Write a protein that binds this DNA or RNA. Structure first.
Lengths: 162, 68, 79, 165, 85, 378, 82, 80, 86, 74
RNA sequence: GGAUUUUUGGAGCAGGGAGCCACGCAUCGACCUGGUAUUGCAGUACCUCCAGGAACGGUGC
């Protein structure tokens, strides 16, 4: 069950609860993110929850995409050119995925508008200094794992890793 | 001499964009063929102004705050 | 359903003091008691006033006929 | 279908609260809508509405006391049905607070069902113990909590729990 | 209709055409057209002769236009006077 | 993630694609032949097959059936080659895991979808056999690239430009055919015998629009040839050659529109304020003119083909022109791959209007018949 | 009386028209219609604060006209007859 | 008018609308009146500053519309 | 008399000028009493209408597609290019 | 008063000193000679008050209807 | 066939100065630090209060 324009064309389309245009891609067992061209850049965010995607990569240039819900997939790596295809990405929900090393979260530093980030229920979470590492390497984030990035944490992350 | 198709919006709360960058909110109580409106419990965007007449001439856009 | 014209007819009968929002001019609004009006929403106002929202200043007019061209909005005031 | 959350940090602006709520709760199923106001009465609270009922029960059990913007949230099943649900959809005791039925064996037991039923402050009666270990009689102080427990394990892969209708 | 052109406010134009007298037209463009009315209509479209157009840019300016047609919407005011004299 | 597996899958996919476009080139050799022929006149070195092969439409021994479809498959192969280039790019850029592979032992699933979903993702041909297009490019449509008057590269529509041209010359003395006669000018004519003055605005603008059109048409009609290669070739020819125009009498012409006695004065003129000004203002136009030139040269066959078409249609009658248009239309919107008792009926109660709602809001002309509807298949 | 009728007679005259948006248009009238929509040929049009552009043809929505400057030669007394 | 018939044809399709003030509304056209009055649903609005918002239900007066973009599904009224 | 002055340019590519000063170029397919216009394959320009501007011809160009423009906001039209054959 | 309409009001004010405000903020004081159906207005011995200050003494004047904001007797 | 959705207009007008950088006036809004109040089952112009911050945003002249 490949991602398809045909798949995308019959997919529930609606205005969500936070007033944004959202496309429902949930629960199709998609393994690879591809063929997004067919959405025609018409959505604020895409719901990819409960699928089998391994890597957050493969996006076309999508200027309107601001929210990506990627819950319960198998994300173990993040693509390197994400800001070049998603310039205004502001919210990224990655709860319950497979990111294991702090260094695998490095590609998120290039998403200049990224403000809401959620990486809960990922092995990487239990790594020593996981929160400070994210704060220093992705300073554009204001809310991390539903907790406010505070000044004291920023300073503390400036010492360690300076 | 057509009517605007607004019966669907009758007695609903609405958000009205007017010319001059002016915005008000209130409940639709009626209309005529010129799209002049009667709006009840109207609020200038906030200060309460009560029941008012809006001339259709100066109506840019309306948005329902309810489900029709 | 209340028709807008009728609301006016009500304003007329009530002799409620009325405040008019003008078209493409925000800094000034007009006030008065509707004595009569016509098919074009042209209004005859009594003891009318120019209201400067910026200057908090009022200009006294007396007997006014305001063309309806200018009408954006019609409201009532307790004063 | 709707969960009532309280004990929320009321300093978060309304639109941010709703967007984080949406994000957090999307992991369990599609959230249809969120009602949250900052009035004195309603501040620190929110109603989260899900398309699927199983999603609401799962959310309730898994996020009970989850630290959100600094405070541990308290979740419960809403007292009434949400207007949106009633419109999308279209007896006197129902909802009832006593669920008796069986079809829940497999070394299952009374301290098991007592802790699962315990999860709920409504934890009142729990009857699961004979050679059976498959007949469950659960008396939950109130149907929000009986409904919470029932909605939490509403498809114990299929068990049969029948309110005392 | 002629009666309304003859006695109503447009009699200003009716009088200017009959007497071949000058009138100053204050105009929407912030310009003023000074001349004689060869013809006019309901909308205050006009065919004008010997038009002196005057405006400002501060610097005053003017220019002569023998023959021209004015679309009447641009009219603000039309003035009759002891101007022709 | 073991890179070995990834690089493996990459080489495998590349293999799959090569195999696909090779199968294509196999069923209808024209696909390559066509392409190659054009390539021949752009990069002179290119070796091309024996003419006999081309004609008989054969690659070795078997002569294949002659085939909109050719172009289609060429664009499909185009996207395929794009994929391939991408994969090639990314590619250029034990007990531990075997233990974790034990994860979730109990799944009742058949897994036959890695090479089959790919092989399938790139193969010919709907349920069975309706659309030649592969799943890879299932939403590929030529009609969104070619207009009806172009007939997938058969002709180029220049009527529009004849219109704009009339608008440019500010008259009507110019006919479609005289306009084409003008186009023909485009190595020296378009430069020394210009339709209009080459410093005219309207003219330069027109020339720009037209040039752009011809170029896009060119690459549109020959997907299979590397566009970037051609572009760069032309650009380098422009920079390195284009005192390329030399006369034994007047010397060296400059696209300043002046000649020059010797190469010496020509060189010391390329630094002068005049030439700096001009080359700094009219650069884009000169370059566009040049492109129009070389692209029109590469399309000589299409230019001629169209001019011919024009003369034909022109010499038609009404009915003829109409039927021809019908033909162009059909070619445009066609699949790329083909598979008395008057009082008797009143007395008997028939031919009276009636309707059944449950059946397609159907109409019945008789009451006996509708009473028979109650027992029916539908 | 209806002065648009007068303008409709001016086919093949060359005029200068000043627009409401300040633009200046000089060309030869091919047609004026009842809405004062005006069509021209051999047109030199100068938008306010540009150098002129030449157009073989230009079509103006009537309402956007401020005024026409007519040929000095024009025999108005003839044209005003119906 | 011929354009009006083509507008009514776009009812039920996704369309884009710019107002006289340059706000840009994209969504499903529910109803189009003769005078160009437009009822739409599930809108994305893009203001003059660039910011976006989302609306469920809107209705815009015909006079205060500058233009509309319709699908290309319609392009195929060629008689006129 | 003839009514043709619009009908002539029908099917042609046309350069239309808006009241704010935008340039809409599309295929002129239909009009009406108000001069509401139907423009196929329509693009919008802001900065320039090129007459072969040596620097570039095209800045702030936007692809729109099938456009219906209201006549209220139309100022003028000129012929931009001939009809596409399609 | 028992309903006093636009039209009669203006007709009562003919023969009288009036001042008209225009939308553009100019003001014109003079004797109202006449008005017509479209509410075009004819003043005699007109004076111009701009910024509320006497600017120009103008004489006989036609004001196009669309320019008028309001009319006052004075 | 000039009186609210098109063709007889609500248009018209106002920005450089100082040494690549920075900017007058008025109104409204979130907004950011601290601290502090509320534990309330809803369908919403906004939503605790107290002090400090605005090299913030929009509109008009």
């Amino acid at each position: 069950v490949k991602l398809t324009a045909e798949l995308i064309e019959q997919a529930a389309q609606y205005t969500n609860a936070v007033r944004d245009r959202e496309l429902d891609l949930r629960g199709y067992k998609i393994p690879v993110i591809e063929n997004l061209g067919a959405t025609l850049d018409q959505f604020d965010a895409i719901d990819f929850s409960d699928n089998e995607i391994r890597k957050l990569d493969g996006f076309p240039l999508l200027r309107r995409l601001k929210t990506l819900l990627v819950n319960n997939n198998r994300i173990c790596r993040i693509g390197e050119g994400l800001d070049q295809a998603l310039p205004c990405l502001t919210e990224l929900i990655l709860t319950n995925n497979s990111l294991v090393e702090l260094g695998d979260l490095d590609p998120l530093a290039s998403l200049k508008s990224l403000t809401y980030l959620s990486i809960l229920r990922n092995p990487v979470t239990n790594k020593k200094h996981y929160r400070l590492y994210v704060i220093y390497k992705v300073p554009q984030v204001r809310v991390l794992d539903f907790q406010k990035v505070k000044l004291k944490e920023r300073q503390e992350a400036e010492k360690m890793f300076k | 001499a057509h009517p605007p198709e607004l019966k669907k919006f009758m007695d609903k709360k609405l958000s009205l964009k007017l010319n001059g960058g002016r915005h008000v909110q209130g409940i639709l109580r009626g209309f005529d063929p010129f799209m002049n409106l009667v709006i009840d419990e109207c609020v200038e965007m906030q200060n309460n102004i009560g029941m008012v007449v809006i001339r259709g001439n100066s109506i840019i856009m309306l948005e329902a705050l309810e489900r029709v | 359903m209340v028709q807008p014209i009728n609301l006016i007819f009500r304003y007329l009968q009530n002799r409620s003091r009325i405040q008019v929002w003008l078209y493409e001019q925000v800094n000034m609004r007009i006030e008065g008691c509707i004595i009569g009006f016509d098919e074009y929403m042209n209004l005859v106002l009594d003891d009318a006033e120019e209201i400067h929202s910026k200057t908090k200043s009022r200009k006294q007019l007396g007997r006014i006929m305001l063309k309806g061209d200018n009408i954006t909005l019609l409201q009532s005031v307790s004063n | 279908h709707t969960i009532y959350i309280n004990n929320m940090n009321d300093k978060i602006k309304k639109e941010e609260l709703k967007r984080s709520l949406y994000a957090l709760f999307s992991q369990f199923g599609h959230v249809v809508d969120i009602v949250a106001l900052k009035t004195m009465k309603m501040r620190g609270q929110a109603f989260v509405i899900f398309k699927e009922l199983g999603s609401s029960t799962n959310a309730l059990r898994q996020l009970q006391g989850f630290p959100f913007y600094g405070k541990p949230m308290r979740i419960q099943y809403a007292k009434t049905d949400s207007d949106i649900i009633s419109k999308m959809r279209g007896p006197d005791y129902p909802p009832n607070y006593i669920l008796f039925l069986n079809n829940l064996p497999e070394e299952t037991n009374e301290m098991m069902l007592s802790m699962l039923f315990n999860q709920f402050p409504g934890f009142k009666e729990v009857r699961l113990v004979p050679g059976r270990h498959d007949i469950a009689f659960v008396e939950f102080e109130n149907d929000g909590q009986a409904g919470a427990a029932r909605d939490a394990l509403q498809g114990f892969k299929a068990m049969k729990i029948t309110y005392a209708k | 209709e002629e009666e309304e052109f003859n006695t109503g406010p447009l009699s200003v134009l009716t009088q200017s055409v009959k007497n071949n007298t000058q009138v100053l037209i204050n105009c929407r463009n912030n310009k003023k057209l000074l001349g004689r009315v060869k013809a006019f209509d309901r909308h205050c479209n006009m065919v004008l002769e010997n038009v002196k157009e005057m405006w400002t840019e501060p610097v005053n300016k003017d220019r002569y236009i023998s023959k021209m047609f004015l679309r009447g919407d641009s009219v603000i005011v039309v003035l009759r006077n002891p101007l022709i004299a | 993630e073991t890179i070995l597996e990834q690089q493996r899958r990459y080489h495998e996919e590349k293999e799959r694609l090569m195999d696909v476009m090779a199968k294509e080139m196999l069923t209808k050799k024209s696909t390559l032949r066509d392409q190659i022929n054009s390539d021949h006149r752009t990069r002179a070195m290119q070796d091309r097959y024996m003419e006999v092969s081309g004609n008989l439409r054969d690659l070795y021994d078997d002569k294949d059936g002659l085939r909109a479809e050719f172009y289609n498959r060429l664009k499909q192969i185009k996207e395929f080659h794009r994929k391939h280039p991408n994969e090639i790019c990314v590619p250029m850029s034990l007990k531990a895991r075997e233990n974790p592979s034990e994860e979730a032992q109990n799944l009742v699933e058949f897994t036959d979808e890695e090479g089959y979903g790919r092989y399938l993702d790139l193969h010919d041909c709907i349920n069975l056999k309706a659309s030649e297009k592969l799943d890879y490019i299932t939403y590929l449509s030529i009609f969104d690239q070619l207009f009806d008057i172009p007939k997938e590269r058969k002709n180029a529509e220049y009527k529009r430009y004849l219109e704009m041209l009339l608008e440019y010359l500010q008259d009507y003395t110019d006919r479609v055919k005289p306009l084409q006669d003008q186009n023909e000018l485009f190595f020296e004519k378009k430069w020394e015998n210009g339709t209009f003055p080459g410093w005219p605005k309207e003219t330069s603008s027109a020339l720009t629009h037209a040039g752009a059109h011809l170029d896009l048409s060119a690459f549109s009609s020959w997907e299979e040839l590397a566009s970037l290669g051609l572009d760069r070739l032309k650009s380098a020819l422009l920079a390195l050659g284009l005192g390329t125009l030399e006369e034994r009498a007047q010397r060296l012409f400059s696209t300043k529109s002046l000649e020059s006695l010797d190469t010496s004065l020509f060189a010391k003129n390329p630094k002068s304020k005049g030439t700096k000004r001009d080359t700094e203002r009219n650069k884009d136009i000169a370059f566009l003119e040049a492109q129009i030139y070389e692209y029109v040269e590469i399309l000589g066959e299409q230019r001629h083909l169209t001019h011919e078409n024009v003369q034909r249609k022109q010499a038609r009658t009404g009915e003829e022109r109409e039927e021809e248009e019908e033909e162009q239309i059909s070619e445009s919107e066609s699949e790329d791959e083909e598979n008395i008792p008057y009082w008797l009926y009143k007395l008997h109660g028939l031919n009276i209007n009636y309707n059944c709602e449950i059946c397609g809001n159907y109409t019945y002309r008789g009451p006996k018949a509708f009473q028979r509807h109650f027992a029916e298949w539908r | 009386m209806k002065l648009v009728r007068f303008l409709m007679k001016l086919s093949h005259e060359t005029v200068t028209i000043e627009l409401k948006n300040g633009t200046q248009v000089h060309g030869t009238i091919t047609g004026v219609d009842v809405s004062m929509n005006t069509h021209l040929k051999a047109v030199k049009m100068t938008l306010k604060n540009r150098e002129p552009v030449q157009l073989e043809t230009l079509s103006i929505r009537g309402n956007n006209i401020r005024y026409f400057i007519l040929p000095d030669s024009l025999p108005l007394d003839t044209l005003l007859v119906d | 008018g011929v354009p009006i018939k083509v507008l009514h044809e776009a009812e039920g399709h996704i369309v884009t609308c710019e107002t006289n003030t340059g706000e840009v509304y994209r969504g499903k056209l529910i109803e189009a009146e003769d005078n160009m009055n437009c009822q739409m649903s599930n809108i994305t609005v893009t203001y003059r500053d660039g910011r976006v918002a989302q609306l469920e239900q809107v209705y815009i007066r015909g006079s205060k519309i500058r233009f509309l973009i319709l699908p290309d599904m319609l392009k195929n009224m060629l008689k006129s | 008399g003839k009514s043709s002055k619009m009908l002539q340019h029908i099917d042609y590519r046309m350069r239309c000028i808006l009241q704010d000063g935008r340039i809409f170029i599309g295929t002129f397919k239909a009009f009406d009493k108000h001069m509401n216009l139907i423009l196929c394959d329509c693009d919008e320009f802001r900065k320039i209408k090129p007459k072969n501007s040596k620097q570039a011809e095209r800045e702030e160009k936007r692809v729109l597609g099938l456009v219906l423009l209201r006549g209220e906001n139309l100022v003028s039209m000129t012929v931009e290019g001939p009809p596409p054959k399609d | 008063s028992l309903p006093l309409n636009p039209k009669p009001f203006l007709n009562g004010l003919t023969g009288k000193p009036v001042m008209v405000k225009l939308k553009w903020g100019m003001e014109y004081k003079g004797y109202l000679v006449s008005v017509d159906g479209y509410m075009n207005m004819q003043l005699a011995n007109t004076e111009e008050y701009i910024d509320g200050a006497l600017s120009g003494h103008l004489g006989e004047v036609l004001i196009r209807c669309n320019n008028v904001l309001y009319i006052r007797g004075v």
